[PDB]
Design a protein around this ligand. Structure first.
Ligand SMILES: CCCCCCCCCCCCCCCCCC(=O)OC[C@H](COP(=O)(O)O)OC(=O)CCCCCCCCCCCCCCCCC
Ligand SMILES: CCCCCCCCCCCCCCCC(=O)O
Ligand SMILES: CCCCCCCCCCCCCCCC(=O)O
Lengths: 384, 384
């Protein structure tokens, strides 16, 4: 729609690049001179554009490699089977019927495994190609030289698709991974402050997105290893795995924010008057943690190295101040009258928030370690 | 491999059914008498078997309705466009190229909305059909009496696929949903015991499956409404949504077990000497909760109603005993010496573990209420 297009103007360009490739193919088809070989079977060239045109360059290269491997293997096996069938001379229609059963059984069985679950598009092309070659080459009997004219058009369609996809506003999966890693830091930094403000008041998509994107980052990393060097990523083998390592450390840090958010929806809650004692100490930690996460995200985005000053000094000091405050007023969290039930559970429930906050601060040193590793493997610019 | 056959023997029945349908079609094709139309185009029937065969029966009905809708809309638009194009006369190829560009842009833009992620297969059978009908019907001027003969072979392949799929050992999505719901209770029950035992030692897939398969239940629900009555689910409008409501309540209860597991991986851990004091109470709650979850899962499995006894009496008693114990020995969690850092946090972690366990026991009434509602909407039988 208008809103969807304006929000992400990329989709309009992708739709008009697909329309351009279809027009550039239909013009050749409709103006080509008559031929005895490609004047009736030319349709196989405009339907390849609709099947091999993906959203990124790396996806197009990898999927096209898989489809060409399946097609060439199915064609070689079908040619061998057809040549071998003639030996019997009287049960050809039975041998060719048993071949279909055997190959279809194995092709279906092998595509249901829990490992090759993302490559069913390459198994289906094998199953369609074996059947097409075996059935269409029975009456004619010379599909050897007819199967290459149907691959020449496929090659023309895939060449046009790749040229139009690559030389007109390409979309790179590496930049997608870079942008996603930059965006997760801001999502977590917003959620942490929303949780602290909601609890102290007299938050979902942040950690939801930061915890449910491991598959997306893995797929984007798989696509990114095919693309050639370009732009700022000037190196033969860029270290794309350190981006996944930094996102794993960030998710380990965001699981405590998810626990903090779940502390607000619980059935048992402490009285509002008791929460107001630790307001300043609770707010300072959220402020410093969000500042740190935004500073790390900004350094990642600009491809810059960490400065010489310690970044964790302020948050560490705030955590120590909160600990001392908790120690001073510890008698609010328990009752010494019984020292040797809803009210007691409520009173003890106010210390879970502070214990989880201190554990969140304790988990922040491994994100800095992973960032230093990434800033070293990939040559980041020296700070100004 | 071979072991996968024994683990799930129904994937070998699926592969053999696929081979059976392929060989029935190949046996009709290899023996059909010569005809003026089917002697050369009888390969469109065996290709449809490989496209419209699905694991379940409701997925086959739903995706064959989507595919037939796309094919017929595309064919009607293409024929009307060709007839309107002939009116222009000259520049007719300019008109056809413009039409192909506009339709390709629209069909590419409409399959990118985030509300249509699951129908990106019913949008791709419309652009192939439009381009096929427009390009192949230009050099003869007649493509209306041939498309009728090209659709009969498709309807024959789809009729054979559905007959063989539905009359030889069918698989039902409602049974898959029923079994998934029954297995979630077992997984959560095993995870709670694993977490408590691991904490008290001198777990992951359990809650992971329950909290990481929400879309699976909705996909099986979308397929299950298309299937006819059968077996014990003898009702035209089966409340398949109450299974989803029960799974949602169980997921809400599994989010606390996730945090109980996370307490073991923290960087701050309490001393074991203080841990040993609260051992019998923790184990009693850890066994009562698992026995209740396994009883609810068993009563869902056999479709039986709740008895006259109260299932939550024992867990409530164990929780009250744990709270009284915490109240007696509360002086070990806090220090009264400085009443008005690492050691204090380590001591305070015990209260977090106890509080999370108590919240787990406090959230079970929602699951019991959901089970009672499900056993009311569907006619569950009376106990014994
Ligand atoms: C109103 C009247 C309306 C009536 C309606 C009339 C019906 C109109 C019919 C239009 C049908 C045309 C649609 C296009 C066909 C469907 C495509 C499809 O669905 O499949 C997708 C399916 C899945 O695609 P993917 O998952 O995206 O990869 O596979 C395909 O892409 C198409 C493959 C077709 C099989 C071609 C096999 C060719 C043989 C190999 C070539 C020779 C190489 C061997 C070399 C020798 C080696 C030594
Ligand atoms: C009825 C027309 C059918 C046309 C089906 C086209 C499907 C093509 C699938 C094979 C893609 C091969 C990718 C390009 C390989 C290469 O360029 O060498
Ligand atoms: C040429 C390749 C074939 C591609 C087929 C894609 C379109 C599939 C449409 C399936 C509709 C089947 C209708 C069956 C009618 C019935 O038996 O009730």
């Amino acid at each position: 729609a208008w809103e969807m297009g304006v929000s992400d103007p990329r989709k309009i360009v992708f739709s008009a690049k697909i329309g351009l490739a279809l027009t550039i193919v239909a013009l050749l088809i409709f103006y080509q001179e008559p031929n005895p070989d490609l004047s009736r079977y030319s349709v196989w060239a405009i339907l390849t554009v609709v099947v091999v045109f993906e959203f990124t360059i790396g996806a197009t290269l990898s999927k096209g490699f898989n489809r060409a491997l399946g097609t060439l293997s199915a064609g070689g096996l079908a040619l061998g089977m057809a040549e071998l069938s003639t030996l019997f001379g009287d049960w050809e229609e039975i041998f060719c019927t048993l071949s279909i059963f055997c190959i279809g059984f194995l092709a279906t069985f092998m595509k249901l495994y829990p490992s090759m679950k993302a490559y069913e598009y390459g198994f289906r092309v094998f199953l369609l190609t074996y059947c097409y070659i075996l059935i269409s080459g029975f009456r004619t009997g010379q599909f050897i030289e007819v199967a290459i004219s149907r691959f020449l058009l496929i090659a023309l369609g895939a060449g046009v698709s790749l040229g139009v996809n690559m030389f007109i506003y390409p979309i790179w999966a590496g930049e997608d991974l870079h942008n996603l890693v930059v965006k997760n830091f801001m999502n977590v930094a917003t959620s942490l402050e929303g949780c602290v403000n909601g609890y102290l008041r007299c938050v979902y998509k942040g950690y939801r997105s930061a915890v449910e994107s491991t598959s997306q980052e893995e797929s984007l990393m798989s696509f990114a290893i095919w693309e050639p060097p370009h732009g700022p990523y000037k190196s033969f083998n860029y270290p794309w795995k350190n981006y996944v390592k930094l996102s794993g450390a960030l998710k380990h840090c965001a699981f405590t924010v998810m626990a903090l958010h779940g502390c607000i929806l619980s059935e048992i809650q402490a009285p509002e008057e008791r929460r107001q004692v630790f307001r300043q100490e609770l707010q300072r930690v959220g402020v410093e943690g969000a500042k740190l996460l935004r500073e790390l995200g900004e350094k990642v985005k600009k491809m810059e190295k960490l400065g010489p000053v310690d970044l964790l000094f302020e948050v560490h000091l705030a955590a120590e101040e909160l600990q001392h405050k908790i120690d001073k007023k510890s008698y609010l969290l328990v009752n010494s009258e019984c020292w040797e039930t809803y009210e007691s559970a409520s009173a003890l429930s106010l210390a879970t928030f502070a214990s989880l906050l201190i554990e969140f601060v304790a988990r922040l040193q491994n994100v800095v370690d992973a960032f230093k590793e990434l800033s070293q493997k990939a040559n980041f610019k020296e700070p100004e």
